[PDB]
Amino acid sequence: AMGSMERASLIQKAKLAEQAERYEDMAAFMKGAVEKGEELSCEERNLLSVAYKNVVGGQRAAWRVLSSIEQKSNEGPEVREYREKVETELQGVCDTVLGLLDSHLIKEAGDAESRVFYLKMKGDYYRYLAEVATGDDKKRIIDSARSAYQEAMDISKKEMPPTNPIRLGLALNFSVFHYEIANSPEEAISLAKTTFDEAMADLHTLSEDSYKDSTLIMQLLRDNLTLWT
């Protein structure tokens, strides 16, 4: 649908849409930019991720409200029907993001920073699918999230310092996966603690600005550890 707009114009409009808090538009501009077929820069990857995180974040919040109402009513068909409508929409957005990653962002990503970023996204969007999945479907979706996060972790531990913000955010989100999806709270706690401690020990190497970036995410790891222990 964005095929007639220049790549650079899509990127410019995605930044405008962010400023206007128009995240559906932002995501559509960044989908158009990905579909131009060129690799994404660091800033462009962040625009893609921010756009879809906001879109799916609103869907997830609405799905949770509706799921809670539906569960209370099971203690007419309308609540279930509407929860199903929101759920299908959410699944469609996750499938769209996964399809961009598969066609062809991941396979073209050779540098560790890009490949880890995209594999973390792949884990995240399978995790959002897992949040709404029920049954054996849930098993295979969970394993797809796990496999994406694990490949990202393996690359990040070989190629990035322990304070790298992508490496830290990946570990944070994989720990949430373990706690909330995989029923592995001890694995979640161990990953968050090890990640925090290894980052702490590397802070001495950082500039003031990098220190701020890394310590921000470390505080999120600590916040989860405080909630989980």
């Binding site: 800033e43 625009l47 921010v50 995240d124 989100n173 949430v176 909330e180 979640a188 995410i217 916040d223």
Partner: peptide, 9 residues
């Protein structure tokens, strides 16, 4: 449990 907020560029 909080994941990366990730909502602001």
């Amino acid at each position: 449990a909080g994941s990366i907020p990730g909502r602001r560029s």
